[PDB]
Enzyme design. Structure first.
Site: not given
Ligand SMILES: O=C(NO)[C@H](NC(=O)[C@H]1[C@H]2C[C@@H]3C[C@@H](C[C@H]1C3)C2)c1ccc(-c2cc(F)c(F)c(F)c2)cc1
Ligand SMILES: [Zn+2]
Ligand SMILES: O=C(NO)[C@H](NC(=O)[C@H]1[C@H]2C[C@@H]3C[C@@H](C[C@H]1C3)C2)c1ccc(-c2cc(F)c(F)c(F)c2)cc1
Ligand SMILES: O=C(NO)[C@H](NC(=O)[C@H]1[C@H]2C[C@@H]3C[C@@H](C[C@H]1C3)C2)c1ccc(-c2cc(F)c(F)c(F)c2)cc1
Ligand SMILES: [Zn+2]
Ligand SMILES: [Zn+2]
Lengths: 518, 511, 510
Positions: C371, C294
């Site tokens: 996931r 990130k």
């Molecule tokens: O890392 C994550 N889950 O473990 C999740 N990541 C994603 O949704 C991205 C990741 C995984 C994907 C493919 C691509 C785009 C999208 C879907 C990279 C995710 C979850 C929360 C946030 C998130 C970021 C913020 F800045 C925020 F304020 C918030 F509330 C949530 C950002 C990404």
């Molecule tokens: Zn993640």
């Protein structure tokens, strides 16, 4: 004079309020040693407690009312503390069997309030005036403040209490009543009485500047703003001249005119003058950056964080100077002649705009190589400074929303001052102190001057290697002041109050105190 | 009416093909219970195999040629399966000793949704490309309801047709269909052909680039469509828009060389008018972004000729409704057409502009211009005195992240209206999903200076904020908002879908 | 169970407050008929003005105090307006010459408040509470409120009043409510107090920083909670997980210094079991993104201690369930807990890993770790033989773009279940919206080399693609998925929401 429109719905002038509700408030100052009368409206005590952080509230004034005095005994007040910004309302019946409201605002434990501290106290006070329909406010000073702090209190109260509704239509505030009366109780009241109407004047200069700044770029454009200046001038009996594009041409201001080339509004150069009767001992030129909108031009503000939507604020310098003109023309100081200048224009994208790489010619004959069309302000100031110095003045002071870098050096509270002359720089700092508008002295580092050497032109507009933008821009401007004491005040970081979502009208008081103390 | 040009080589109208090769196709529906005559052109069997994984190809239908019957025997077709989208070609000589051509398209195991059927038709259409044929015959050995059969035809026509208006440097002439209970299906044939054209017409305008399709030429195109349909029509120019105080909509158009043109068509049924509907379309013929220039990576500025897809849908619907002529309704087809450009005359970020209902708006971002044009169009629509207002718009890029490229989103202030939109989504086979207008976010639209902010500085759910903005411009009328920003362009095929023509026509007809 | 440390100053447990000053507040509910008494502390009237936007304050309740009545007469209160969240309170002497504070909170011009509205009202209430030394709050309802909104009010009041000070180096003791038909509301009180703590408890785990709240210490917390509630409990370590062949879950945790821990708490009713339920919480203690770090601006890596908000919601529900003791149900509280870190031992973009059901997965982006852990948690859940599987997870950033920070999304393979989740949303006042699992997108997860792709390289509807991926790991069981990525953190207030606790409890109870 005539404002161009694309469609008939386009505004052709800036709405301006002169007679604000503030001007209709009767202000009386009483000496506290004779006891407070508590008969109506809201009576607020300014209370601190030295040494004891968050110590208890003790009311020390004499109150000419038994029932109110009974309520204000320290046994009843012990539960409340003086934590800066804290307030409380009380309700009771006085001796005449009339309901009244009383309260206090906390001022902390330090027996010496800074400007910032006093602003926090005024802001708590203003929250007490909002959403409550009152005819009168009474403020009882149970803290020590000097005359300058007392005026600052009033100015800040006036400015923060006033609400700008020029652009509200269906969404006015339906319950926005203003008090008609302000009472003040303070020790040695006679010496403070003169600060009242001065405060009232300083308030409007600030508010006036604020109205111009907040006015959007469709409303506030180079024609309508220079029109606003004339009207102001006409009301204060100042000599005024507005230079149009053709007069600007014969004066050869190619740096200034180049910036405005892409606008639909013609360049207008504002020149107001105040002259004392009698002997003029001091001649001063105040120069304000007047970019009514700054899109960046072909170096478009497109980058994340460039905030193109704020860029109506890029004539704040000009606004401060016109507000200073209001205060100076109103308070009519002796022994001075002041020129109020602004090279007003709009930086736009068009088939007609100037381009990165363009070499242009300033009115002192220096060729300038444009490196970035978004550094337009310094080019406009260049021609304005040359014009200023040709007036044969003792001091040249410019104030401008010049560089973003100020956010990273001083942030949002302090403006930076640069200058070629130490005596002049100290005079600004003194005015900073008595205007309570904070300014910090920053250096002009000559070692960077070599990065403004152009391969083809006399001078580069921007550095390609130095990141100290505020300092580089000062170097560039110095090149256009030949042999005159000159100071530069960068207000890019402090002009806009982000937390309140409004302008500060920053600089009006700094500049006026400067003129008056001289 | 006159289209301004910079050079004499700039186009002064949109080329539009009204009579397409699809129209020159004679269509015949036959009952399969009577047997097929496989004699000419190409004959295709749509085969399934219920439940049985990738089951073999089984020909259930009776074929009035002994020879072909021998070829199509269960033994011969066992080495072929019914995989969704699969196909094979058969060559033989018939009872007449004439060469004929036969084949099948696999329709899978599940006895089919919209997305299933499409893949079937794209397989058929592949067979119609790179083979010169005078007639196609299709034998259904699957089960479809009437709405699905029409969808098959609509989709067949649309995908078969090829847009060649901008090239410089053999369609079949007969379609035979074999289907059970053929008599119930025949009525669907010309309905499909109408829906096909309203759709392909919307596609033509959208696909037409912004130097062809500008506010003047698009509105001339609308007039030309009205006259041919005998619709009433009025085009509002800058002077009347000024008199109507459409300050929001005029602001967006300030920077363009093409004057704003407001499109207003009307269909009125003979007899008793029971429902008055206003259909409003976003009609930005090009979105540069204005001074908030579309310059960020991913902003796809070259796509932005599509930003009048809503207007396209509405005009497409006007063709369908003007052709099918339903009763009991009065339909107003509206679009505030303009171009959003960078110029000395453009509106600026920060500007405060006044809408025709008196509301002042602080502009935060010149690239949120769709909702400014819709604001004045909606004020206009509600003044007509209608029962329903439905707007359709390529409003927010956030749709791509919420529903993606398949489903549009509907918002509205009325449950009954929203259900009718949803019911229309079902019968039109253009999928829509109901999204909420969350009132918690409305406070971020409070401006310090203007009546309302154009945009939020803090909420990232753009589709909802825009919906809350539009809602301020409908006072007391049932209203819904279809955001088609994600579904309007087909990135795979690189062409419009004409999304929304069928959806809106099904809405009109069903009311 | 032993928490590994880098240096001897690294924490080895998560601090928890179980006894809070909210638990010491005596709550009484009085009928509004008979008049209100104003004897001490602060008395707040909740008031609206139907139709008149920013209209004047009018108090209709009788007040059994002549001094305070005078203050509340129409000619004085109209000085104030009912604008949502606006307040005024005054100190005065009552009939007994005792100092009492009286005031109001404006409830706008709409006659039936939403959950966001009530929250604004309570926030304005709490401000006065935090700014006054008080022994008693009395709240007078001159607005309409159903049982569920009355409870939601108390819950939110308790939660927002409570201050979490575990990491830093005088509350009221009485709460009085006046309301018409007071007897119908009285039962909601102790229910609110229980819902409050489950939410506050979940809040505590979320806010706890990642050096405090790691897989080992978080599983330890859950054991401690289960012991206090007489819940059966089982913590799976790496050896067992390896035997269960949980390859997607283990792969995510490879880069951490903390071994994976799998929490499995179970509540069982005394009587016959009629419904078996599994609740599955995403439990990533910290999400650095892994090798897909990130680093992009706006990715808020400093927030990523919140990535176990799902597990926290599951454990708060366990507190509520173990406390209220629903009948005829068996509930399994599950979470595959780990930490997504960067190291020589981390899994890599491009890795092909094998889930516990034999499906091979091509990792496309290591920041899509949630996931992966949910795939093995879902398989484990289905092997339990339950009726419903409901998971809750901070899964996809895209939710901020679809529903925002207010509404969570719910996806599912079964409409009965989804309508139950939806109904639970209504009665808990935790706002959720149904979003579709669009099958046309499924093809983008067809890997060239593995059975399935973890992510799509083309489709941008991420919250839907993730739902499609998670669907692959549930074969024949009713299942719903609640994505709380957008709603889990209160950005304005700089603290967690404890979102999901009450929603999952209402589902369990009703
Ligand atoms: O890392 C994550 N889950 O473990 C999740 N990541 C994603 O949704 C991205 C990741 C995984 C994907 C493919 C691509 C785009 C999208 C879907 C990279 C995710 C979850 C929360 C946030 C998130 C970021 C913020 F800045 C925020 F304020 C918030 F509330 C949530 C950002 C990404
Ligand atoms: Zn993640
Ligand atoms: O455009 C400007 N003056 O007309 C000015 N530009 C700069 O300071 C930089 C920019 C443009 C230049 C090339 C290089 C060094 C200099 C000149 C980057 C400038 C001034 C104020 C701000 C500014 C931006 C904010 F987001 C903000 F909140 C603020 F208070 C000021 C940004 C850039
Ligand atoms: O320009 C627009 N409407 O006129 C719209 N823009 C936005 O949604 C952004 C713009 C304007 C706003 C302020 C801020 C956030 C939101 C709202 C920047 C928008 C619409 C479609 C698309 C879009 C982009 C694609 F790359 C794409 F494939 C697509 F299908 C739609 C992107 C932005
Ligand atoms: Zn600039
Ligand atoms: Zn746009």
């Amino acid at each position: 004079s005539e404002v161009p429109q694309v469609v008939s719905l386009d505004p052709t002038s800036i709405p301006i309020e002169y007679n604000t509700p503030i001007h209709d408030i009767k202000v009386q100052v009483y000496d506290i040693k004779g006891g407070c009368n508590v008969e109506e409206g809201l009576t607020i005590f300014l209370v601190n407690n030295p040494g004891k952080e968050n110590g208890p509230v003790k009311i020390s004034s004499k109150v000419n009312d038994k029932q109110v005095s009974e309520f204000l005994k320290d046994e009843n007040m012990e539960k409340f503390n003086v934590k800066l910004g804290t307030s409380k309302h009380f309700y009771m019946f006085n001796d005449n069997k009339n309901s009244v409201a009383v309260g206090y605002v906390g001022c902390g434990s330090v027996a010496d309030l800074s400007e910032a501290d006093m602003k926090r106290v005024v802001l708590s006070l203003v929250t007490m005036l909002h959403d409550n329909k009152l005819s009168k406010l009474t403020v009882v000073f149970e803290i020590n403040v000097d005359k300058n702090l007392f005026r600052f209190f009033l100015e800040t109260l006036f400015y923060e209490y006033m609400t700008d509704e020029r652009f509200k239509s269906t969404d006015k505030n339906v319950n926005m009543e203003y008090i008609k009366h302000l009472g003040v109780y303070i020790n040695n009241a006679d010496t403070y009485k003169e600060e009242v109407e001065k405060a009232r004047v300083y308030y409007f200069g600030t508010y006036y500047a604020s109205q111009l700044i907040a006015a959007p770029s469709n409303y506030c454009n180079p024609v309508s703003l220079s029109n606003a200046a004339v009207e102001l001038a006409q009301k204060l009996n100042l000599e005024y001249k507005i230079l149009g594009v053709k007069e600007l041409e014969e004066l050869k201001m190619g740096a200034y005119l180049s910036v405005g080339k892409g606008s639909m509004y013609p360049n207008k150069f504002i020149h107001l003058t105040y002259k004392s009767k009698g002997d003029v001992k001091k001649k001063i030129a105040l120069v304000g950056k007047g970019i009514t909108f700054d899109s960046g031009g072909y170096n478009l503000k497109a980058a994340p964080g460039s905030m193109i939507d704020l860029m109506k604020f890029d004539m704040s310098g000009c606004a401060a100077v016109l507000g200073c003109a209001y205060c100076v023309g109103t308070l009519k100081p002796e022994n001075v002649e002041i020129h109020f200048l602004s090279a007003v224009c709009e930086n736009m994208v068009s088939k007609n705009s100037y381009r990165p790489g363009d070499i242009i010619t300033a009115s002192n004959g220096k060729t300038i190589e444009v490196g970035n069309t978004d550094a337009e302000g310094r080019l406009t100031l260049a021609d304005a400074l040359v014009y200023a110095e040709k007036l044969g003045v003792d001091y040249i002071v410019d104030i401008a929303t010049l560089t973003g870098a100020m956010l990273y050096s001083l942030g949002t509270s302090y403006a930076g001052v640069f200058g070629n002359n130490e005596e002049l720089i100290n005079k600004i700092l003194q005015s900073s102190k008595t205007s309570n508008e904070p300014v910090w002295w920053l250096p002009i580092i000559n070692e960077y001057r070599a990065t403004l050497n152009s391969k083809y032109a006399d001078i580069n507009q921007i550095s390609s290697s130095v990141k100290a933008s505020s300092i580089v821009a000062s170097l560039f401007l110095k090149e256009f002041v030949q042999n005159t004491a000159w100071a530069h005040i960068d207000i890019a970081g402090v002009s806009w109050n982000f937390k309140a979502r409004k302008p500060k009208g920053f600089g009006v008081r700094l500049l006026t105190e400067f003129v008056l103390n001289d």
